[PDB]
Amino acid sequence: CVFCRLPAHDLSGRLARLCSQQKECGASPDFSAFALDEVSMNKVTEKTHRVLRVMEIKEAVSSLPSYWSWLRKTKLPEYTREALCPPACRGSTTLYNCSTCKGTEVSCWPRKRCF
Ligand SMILES: *[C@@H]1O[C@H](CO[C@@H]2O[C@@H](C)[C@@H](O)[C@@H](O)[C@@H]2O)[C@@H](O[C@@H]2O[C@H](CO)[C@@H](O[C@@H]3O[C@H](CO)[C@@H](O)[C@H](O)[C@@H]3O)[C@H](O)[C@H]2NC(C)=O)[C@H](O)[C@H]1NC(C)=O
């Protein structure tokens, strides 16, 4: 979900450059199961920018697979609920596919499922 917005962070090139400096590298994982609203896509990209900066300063990639797994299993599900529930969602929202970056307008969830 981190390759669709804020391209000036150059996450792809930064991952490649950190990996030119050692244990194997995995970029990038498949997030095709997810689709996020604009706000959540910015948030997860900014968070990944900050995480990658910490790794760059100390030249350490060993925790990257765990970060991707945490996104897949824990954080991206949280952002998905944020995007579809109040107070963020009213009526409908556009979710952007994490693999293709293409958007689809969908309805918000009912308060029953949200809370
Ligand atoms: C994000 O988008 C990917 C890309 O697939 C898209 O498919 C159409 C919606 C097009 O409009 C394109 O924009 C794009 O290529 C979605 O991945 C795809 O998921 C479908 C599962 O729904 C897979 O389609 C299949 O159809 C036949 C079965 O009839 C077989 O290929 C499979 O059994 C499967 O059902 C398709 O293979 C898959 N594509 C890839 C490359 O994974 C993805 O679902 C979507 N994610 C979200 C969250 O919306």
Residue numbers in the entry: 17 to 37, 42 to 135
Give excerpts from the publication.
Tmem95 knockout murine sperm, which have normal expression and localization of IZUMO1, can bind to, but do not fuse with, eggs. We propose that the interaction of TMEM95 with eggs facilitates membrane fusion of human sperm and eggs.
To understand how TMEM95 binds eggs, we determined a crystal structure of the TMEM95 ectodomain to 1.5 Å resolution using multiwavelength anomalous X-ray diffraction. TMEM95 shows homology to the N terminus of IZUMO1 (14, 15) with a Cα root-mean-square deviation of 7.2 Å and to the N terminus of SPACA6 (17). Unlike IZUMO1 and SPACA6, TMEM95 does not have an immunoglobulin-like domain at the C terminus. We found that the area surrounding the N-glycan is variable, while the opposite side harbors a conserved, positively charged surface. When incubated with hamster eggs, the R70A, R73A, and R70A R73A TMEM95-Fc variants showed drastically reduced egg-binding activities compared to the wild-type.
